[PDB]
Structure 1
Amino acid sequence: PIRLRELIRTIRTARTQAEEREMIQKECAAIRSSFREEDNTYRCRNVAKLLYMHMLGYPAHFGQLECLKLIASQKFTDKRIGYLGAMLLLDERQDVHLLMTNCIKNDLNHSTQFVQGLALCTLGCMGSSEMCRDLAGEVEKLLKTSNSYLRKKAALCAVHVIRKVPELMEMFLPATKNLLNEKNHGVLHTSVVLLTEMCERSPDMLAHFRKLVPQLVRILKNLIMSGYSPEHDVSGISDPFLQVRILRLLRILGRNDDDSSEAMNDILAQVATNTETSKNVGNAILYETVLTIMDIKSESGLRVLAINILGRFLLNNDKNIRYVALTSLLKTVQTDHNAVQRHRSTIVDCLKDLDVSIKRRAMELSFALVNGNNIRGMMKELLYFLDSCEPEFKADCASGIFLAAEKYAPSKRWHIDTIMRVLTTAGSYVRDDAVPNLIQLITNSVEMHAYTVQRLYKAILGDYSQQPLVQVAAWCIGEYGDLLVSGQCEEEEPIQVTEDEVLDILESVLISNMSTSVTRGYALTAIMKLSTRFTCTVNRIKKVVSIYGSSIDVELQQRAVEYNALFKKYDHMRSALLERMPVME
């Protein structure tokens, strides 16, 4: 029975983890044989050493009985370490945490506010939804009291029981009424977090809570005009935590209301001027202000000043504020789509930043910055950026180019030009989900498949290791070989479409192990398609099917058998079912 800090020094005197695990299991067996004696005196430090093992990640699953026993103790420190072990070793899926219900319930009825503080603490940190339905009648009872040490814990415990049971929030509506003049700002902070949560959950609660807008307008005006407080105060603001929470409750309320949005008009006009962009905190205040402005249905004159704020936030050399300004313009995409578009050179300039996050947010901001006019010039630098990307940006950029091109394509020719340029420059980095999207849009095209599939064959002759490229290309060849090989049933004057390497490129994909076997599924599907699309060179692909009948894949063996039966027995049924596939949406 050594001390906790003795085990700390024991593990810190270990260099090798192959020896540190030996030093773990020594004292672990000491704790295990100690728990066989049912000792309630050293149980504090035994469970503490066991939690020190769990913190570095050692087997501590067995010592949860004794955590429950420390919660089932009567001394204060034993209960303290027991609730620590309950928050650390127990969770929702532990399956043994349901025994805490009676103990937390009696410790919610404990005389001390600190033991009730721990009973609210563990229930707010990890109280399961089944435990929420068993304790929320006593959670509100500690909200029916007025102890300012306990009300701040009961309000966020109510946030937790809404978080785990969102159909139990109706019993805290009568418990949250008109406690919104509490002078303790901690209780007031937890109450504004609770109102933000309640307004986030149900629209039926909005109408009860958009009535108390001017009350919290007065509270926020009292906190903004508060020049100094001894506590609550970092960088000269009396509780900016509660200021951001009140501005966030102002952001989610009045977002589709006009009366409450003009009830909060003047305090937003004040805090847009009574902030300070010097340290981090006032920039946070002003950014939450501009978020509140851009999310409510505010006056556009507020939005003039707010876009002036965000143009200043782009100018700040702090990468914090550059991330904030990119997130800012990423938030006000649809709201004020015009005044964000004149930040375009700065948004493109943020693509050359030395951060993964700033390049990511500027990339997505240029993606959301696309309209029906900037599609020409921006996509050139966007694909230049994709060519100058990193392999982690290539999936997101390859998706975003496709998504902003499917909406705002000025020309279906140039649309497929940009798509084919991306399919060359990305290759095996685009997601396979975008491949049926590209297939669906090029079959939504009807007038250009010559220009599509000729350029397809011009590109894919050099490469097949780009896997989604040939995922596109095999279906493209199988559906539009008749437009690829045009009027060439026999040998003519030499045109580059040759109907023998057209089959051999797919066959070379087949023989090569650079093939995900849905490459091979698409390719054999294209082979069976081009027996009717081509009358030029037939009965050579039937050879490929007949020799392919003993391949090692399951479905490809099924596919070769089900083809070879048609190619040898039901040739009259092959051209009957090889019509083009119809267009869906």
Structure 2
Amino acid sequence: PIRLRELIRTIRTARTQAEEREMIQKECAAIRSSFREEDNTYRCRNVAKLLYMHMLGYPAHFGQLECLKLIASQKFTDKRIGYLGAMLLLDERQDVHLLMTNCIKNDLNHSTQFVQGLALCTLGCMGSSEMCRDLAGEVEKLLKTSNSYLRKKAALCAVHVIRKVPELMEMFLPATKNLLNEKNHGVLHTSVVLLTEMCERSPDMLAHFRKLVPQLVRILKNLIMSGYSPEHDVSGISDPFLQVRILRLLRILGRNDDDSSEAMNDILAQVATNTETSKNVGNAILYETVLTIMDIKSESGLRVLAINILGRFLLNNDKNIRYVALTSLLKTVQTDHNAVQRHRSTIVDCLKDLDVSIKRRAMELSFALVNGNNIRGMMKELLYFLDSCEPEFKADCASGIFLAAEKYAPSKRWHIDTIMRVLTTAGSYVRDDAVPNLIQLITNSVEMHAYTVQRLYKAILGDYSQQPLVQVAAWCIGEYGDLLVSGQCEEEEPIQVTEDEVLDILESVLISNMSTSVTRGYALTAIMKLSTRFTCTVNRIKKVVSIYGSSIDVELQQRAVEYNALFKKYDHMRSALLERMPVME
């Protein structure tokens, strides 16, 4: 039985990855040999070594039955080792935790407060969809006890069961009633967390849980008044976790009612100005209070105080404070949107910050703050940010710009120009999913087609490696070939479009190696549709279709064969099915 410290030293003595793997295998061989003999004296050391090997990156599948056997053992060290193994290497998808239900039930009624607590913690950490079904009866029994050290564990187990089984919340309603008078801070915090979870799960208990709002307000006021305490007082803040839980419960309660908001209005006002934000706990409490006020129907003064606090925190040099302020502003975007416009300069400056999280928060705030009047002004800033954005932020910036243009675009021409600029500058950053949205937007607009067609033709001849831009240009050509070239049936004056450059471009795109089989299909469809849309270049695409009918791609080959068959046997019926597709929202 090698000791855990000796095994750790041996592992640390390994330098090469191969040497470490060899040592781990050598230890695991002895561990498996000991396990196969049904060892019970030094089983704790073997379990610890197996857990260390699994954490170090070694398989531990064979060490599954040993943990179950040690769980139902009688030694305290063996029971603790088994519980740790079940918590670490055991999960719902393991399929070996089904037999652990009997062990948990046996240990759930144990007189010892440590074995029962360990079993409850293991059940909460590795709760399964079926384990909670057969353990719900025992969980409720422990929740009604008067054990302070076990009340928190019972509350955590009930919360875990409710999260895993939302339909089991009905059995916890009569157990949590009249439990807000616990003197212990941990019990009160667990009760508050359970009440918040029950309220967030279903709204039926909101009315029942909304009557205790005065009790929660009184508890919060007492906690605020009792600012000195040996336990739970960190950095001058007493019960920061309890205060955060109370603020979250207040924010989640009365968000659509006036009585609940009015009852907690005094507490929010007192905490909004009687809290010290010098430490991180105070800043977190202030942020939670601001979020709760924004998420509830509070008074105008509370909203003004929250706006002032957010403005003050936005100027803080701390990265965490700036991120919290940005998150609060993003959350309070729809609510108090007029008051959020005062931080436009701060939002713009945050985009140039050297923080990835800060930059992302600033970009999100700018995207969410785009209105129907600042869209034109913010378009230049968005384009500048996209041009000088990070490689991982270019696609997100382009998607946000496209969404803003499609939502509150000042005009179709301006929106079309912005979309074309984004496509030309996005390059390989625009997602292929936005291509169908752009196609639908182009099809919906039936007033600006000549300028859009000319712009697409100009931007498609220069480059063709942009898959989304190439697909958009091909779709535009297929939809408006009759408008891109006007009166191009025969030779005419030298213009931008001559009825032959489009066919050459389509052929190059189809035969170009920079094709993912999606742009090639769009080009083939555009060429097929150009037979009826364009009549100047006739009898020329048929040869290409016949030649393209032997392509390696099965779908491409079938499309080429169908096009050749339509051109060679349904020449009169080719135009009978080339009508424009319907346009829908």
TM-score bin, normalised by smaller chain? over 0.9
Distance 1:296 1:289 in 2: 10
Query: TM-score normalised to the size of structure 2?
Result: 0.99
SS at match of 2:573: helix
Deviation at residue 344 of structure 1 after TM alignment:
0.4
Deviation at residue 288 of structure 1 after TM alignment:
0.3
Per-residue CA deviations over 1:10-66 (Å, capped at 9, x if unaligned) read: 100000011100000001000000011101111111011000011111011110111
Task: Provide structure 2 residue ranges, at least 5 long, that are not aligned to the other structure.
Answer: none
Deviation at residue 503 of structure 1 after TM alignment:
1.1
Deviation at residue 499 of structure 1 after TM alignment:
1.1
Distance 1:378 1:549 in 2: 49
Distance 1:275 1:487 in 2: 76
Deviation at residue 433 of structure 1 after TM alignment:
1.3
* Residue equivalent to 1:267: 267
Per-residue CA deviations over 1:317-361 (Å, capped at 9, x if unaligned) read: 111111011101100000001000111011000000101111111
Distance 2:59 2:6 in 1: 19
Deviation at residue 129 of structure 1 after TM alignment:
1.5
Deviation at residue 539 of structure 1 after TM alignment:
1.0
Per-residue CA deviations over 1:157-211 (Å, capped at 9, x if unaligned) read: 1110011000000000100001111011111111111111001000001011011
SS at match of 1:536: coil
SS at match of 1:63: helix
SS at match of 1:461: helix
Distance 1:501 1:380 in 2: 33
Deviation at residue 519 of structure 1 after TM alignment:
0.7
Deviation at residue 274 of structure 1 after TM alignment:
1.5
Distance 1:153 1:573 in 2: 76
Deviation at residue 507 of structure 1 after TM alignment:
1.0
Deviation at residue 226 of structure 1 after TM alignment:
1.1
* Residue equivalent to 1:281: 281
Distance 1:253 1:311 in 2: 26
Deviation at residue 223 of structure 1 after TM alignment:
0.8
Distance 2:540 2:275 in 1: 78
Deviation at residue 434 of structure 1 after TM alignment:
1.1
Distance 1:543 1:391 in 2: 43
Distance 2:146 2:441 in 1: 63
SS at match of 2:230: coil
Deviation at residue 301 of structure 1 after TM alignment:
1.6
Distance 1:395 1:245 in 2: 37
Distance 1:427 1:498 in 2: 27
Distance 2:506 2:575 in 1: 21
Deviation at residue 291 of structure 1 after TM alignment:
0.3
Matched ranges for 1:443-458 at <5 A: 443-458=443-458
Distance 1:350 1:375 in 2: 18
Matched ranges for 1:26-45 at <5 A: 26-45=26-45
Deviation at residue 237 of structure 1 after TM alignment:
1.3
* Residue equivalent to 2:411: 411
SS at match of 1:66: helix
Distance 1:62 1:229 in 2: 50
Query: TM-score normalised to the size of structure 1?
Result: 0.99
In the alignment, structure 1 residue 245 sits paired with structure 2 residue 245: yes
**Number of residues paired by the alignment?**
585
SS at match of 1:129: coil
SS at match of 1:145: coil
> Which of 550-559 and 424-433 deviates more?
424-433
Per-residue CA deviations over 1:114-148 (Å, capped at 9, x if unaligned) read: 11101110001011010000111111111011101
Distance 1:106 1:213 in 2: 39
Deviation at residue 225 of structure 1 after TM alignment:
1.0
Deviation at residue 487 of structure 1 after TM alignment:
1.2
Distance 2:438 2:225 in 1: 57
* Residue equivalent to 1:538: 538
Deviation at residue 457 of structure 1 after TM alignment:
0.8
Deviation at residue 111 of structure 1 after TM alignment:
0.5
Per-residue CA deviations over 1:354-392 (Å, capped at 9, x if unaligned) read: 011111111111000001110111110111000001110
Deviation at residue 482 of structure 1 after TM alignment:
0.7
> Which of 396-405 and 328-337 deviates more?
396-405
Distance 1:365 1:460 in 2: 34
Per-residue CA deviations over 1:285-332 (Å, capped at 9, x if unaligned) read: 000000000000111221011100000011111111110111011000
Deviation at residue 474 of structure 1 after TM alignment:
0.8
Distance 2:166 2:302 in 1: 35
Distance 1:305 1:395 in 2: 37
Per-residue CA deviations over 1:484-522 (Å, capped at 9, x if unaligned) read: 011111000111111111111111111111011111110
Distance 1:453 1:221 in 2: 67
* Residue equivalent to 2:564: 564
Distance 2:514 2:219 in 1: 66
Deviation at residue 239 of structure 1 after TM alignment:
0.5
Q: Runs ≥4 in structure 1, deviation > 2 angstroms?
A: none
Distance 1:336 1:536 in 2: 59
Deviation at residue 444 of structure 1 after TM alignment:
1.1
Deviation at residue 557 of structure 1 after TM alignment:
0.3
Matched ranges for 1:275-354 at <5 A: 275-354=275-354
Per-residue CA deviations over 1:541-568 (Å, capped at 9, x if unaligned) read: 1111011111100100000011110000
SS at match of 2:401: helix
Distance 1:471 1:226 in 2: 66
* Residue equivalent to 2:388: 388
Per-residue CA deviations over 1:448-480 (Å, capped at 9, x if unaligned) read: 011111001111111111110011111111110
* Residue equivalent to 1:199: 199
Deviation at residue 430 of structure 1 after TM alignment:
1.3
SS at match of 2:572: helix
SS at match of 1:316: coil
Deviation at residue 4 of structure 1 after TM alignment:
1.4
Distance 1:313 1:538 in 2: 68
* Residue equivalent to 1:420: 420
Task: Provide structure 1 residue ranges, at least 5 long, that are not aligned to the other structure.
Answer: none
Distance 1:177 1:386 in 2: 54
Per-residue CA deviations over 1:409-460 (Å, capped at 9, x if unaligned) read: 1111000111111101111111111111111111111100111110011111
> Which of 224-233 and 261-270 deviates more?
224-233
Distance 2:225 2:416 in 1: 58
Distance 2:277 2:216 in 1: 24
Distance 2:251 2:308 in 1: 19
